[PDB]
Design a binder for this molecule. Structure first.
Ligand SMILES: *[C@@H]1O[C@H](CO)[C@@H](O[C@@H]2O[C@H](CO)[C@@H](O)[C@H](O)[C@H]2NC(C)=O)[C@H](O)[C@H]1NC(C)=O
Lengths: 72, 35
C-alpha cells in the first residue's frame, strides 16, 4: 500500500467528533509501526444514537477506545 | 447536563397555541422519537 489514512470516531452527548491523519507509506502487510497523533477536523452536532457502523468500498482496521489516562 | 452552560428563556403561548392536542410527551440532549 502507498497511503495510510487514520480516523477517530467518537460520539459524546450528541456530538460526533472526527479526528484524522494522512501519511505516505510503503507496506503491503498491516499498519506500520510508529507514532503519530490525529487531529480534529469535523464536529457534527447530529443528536443521533450510534451503536453500529459499516465501511464502504484496501484493508482496514477497527479498534475500540477506552477511558484511559495518557501522558502526552 | 448538570454542568450546563446556557440560558433558558420561556413565555406563555396561551393566546397562540391553546385552542390543542398536537403536543406529545412521555442522557443529556437525547432525542427519542420512537413510537
Ligand atoms: C441507542 O440504541 C440502543 C439499541 O440499539 C439502546 O440500547 C437499549 O436500551 C434499552 C433501554 O430500555 C434496553 O432495554 C436494551 O436492552 C438496550 N439494547 C442493547 C442492545 O443494549 C441505547 O439505549 C440507545 N441510546 C440512546 C442514547 O438513545
Amino acid at each position: 500500500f502507498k497511503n495510510l489514512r487514520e480516523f477517530v470516531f467518537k460520539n459524546i452527548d450528541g456530538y460526533f467528533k472526527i479526528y484524522s491523519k494522512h501519511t505516505p507509506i510503503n507496506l503491503v502487510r498491516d499498519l506500520p509501526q510508529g507514532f503519530s497523533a490525529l487531529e480534529p477536523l469535523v464536529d457534527l452536532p447530529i443528536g443521533i444514537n450510534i451503536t453500529r457502523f459499516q465501511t464502504l468500498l484496501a484493508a482496514y482496521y477497527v479498534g475500540y477506545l477506552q477511558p484511559r489516562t495518557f501522558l502526552l | 447536563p448538570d454542568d450546563f452552560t446556557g440560558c433558558v428563556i420561556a413565555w406563555n403561548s396561551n393566546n397562540l397555541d391553546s385552542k390543542n392536542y398536537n403536543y406529545l410527551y412521555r442522557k443529556p440532549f437525547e432525542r427519542d422519537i420512537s413510537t
